[PDB]
Symmetry: C2
Subunit: 86 residues, 2 copies
Amino acid sequence: MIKVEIKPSQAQFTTRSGVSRQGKPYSLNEQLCYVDLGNEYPVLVKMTLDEGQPAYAPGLYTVHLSSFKVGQFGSLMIDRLRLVPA
Amino acid sequence: MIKVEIKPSQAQFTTRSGVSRQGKPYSLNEQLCYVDLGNEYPVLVKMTLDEGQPAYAPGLYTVHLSSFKVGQFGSLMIDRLRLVPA
């Protein structure tokens, strides 16, 4: 299990916006977190949230299975980092 | 934890080869596995092994933390799927 932490200072999201190739508007919400990759300190990681989802509250989390997919070359990839409470 | 299975029929690797942009030879060893992504059956996934590593034997495995890295856009990515015995 991957340990992910939302610190008190990371409790909000920011929103970027634009227009798709054929005219549709979009909005993307982004939140930061710290992921422990076994180095001397956890590293800072950016997450794009799914539609209609609030920012995760401060606390400890692990990664949900729905974060993964098989890519176009047949290897495993992260689609979007999706979290569940630890 | 991600459940990964090497079936008896997946106990070998194949090798692809070539030459890098500035002349160095390379060899890449590839092995197949089944990863349970919570659908009705596990899905087939291709793995590229690290240098000097044998094919994983048949059995159950989970994913090692060293499989992950922060990508060039600041989000988490899989570098190479690296396994440890379950």
